[PDB]
Design a protein around this nucleic acid. Structure first.
Length: 50
RNA sequence: UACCUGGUUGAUCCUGCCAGUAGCAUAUGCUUGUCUCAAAGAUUAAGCCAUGCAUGUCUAAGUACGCACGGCCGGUACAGUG
């Protein structure tokens, strides 16, 4: 199941400001960039061996 | 620029030092218009020190949920500056 829809967002409401909601950057999240970095690390191992 | 001169005697010649002479460094005295470089709390006390300053630092690339500011149409998990 996804984790990005269950992030506890804090509500920011201040006088004279348009209200909004703030959510943290999820850490240790699996992302296409993370998988690409892992793939490149294995690829570098492969190239070194070859 | 490898240099000497006065002083022992009634005169002489020496020995010999004292004094003179030139630079250099530090202090000081008097004087000082321009301009260029330029040393400067070493010597006595590695004596004592008020106060201020003299070592901090962020990139696209460690950690941003400080509205601190702020989005473009925003509750895209994370816009961005910080």
């Amino acid at each position: 199941d996804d984790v990005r829809q269950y992030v506890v967002r804090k509500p920011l409401n201040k006088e004279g400001k348009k209200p909004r909601t703030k959510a943290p950057k999820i850490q240790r999240l699996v992302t296409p960039r993370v998988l690409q970095h892992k793939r490149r690390r294995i690829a570098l191992k492969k190239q070194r061996t070859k």
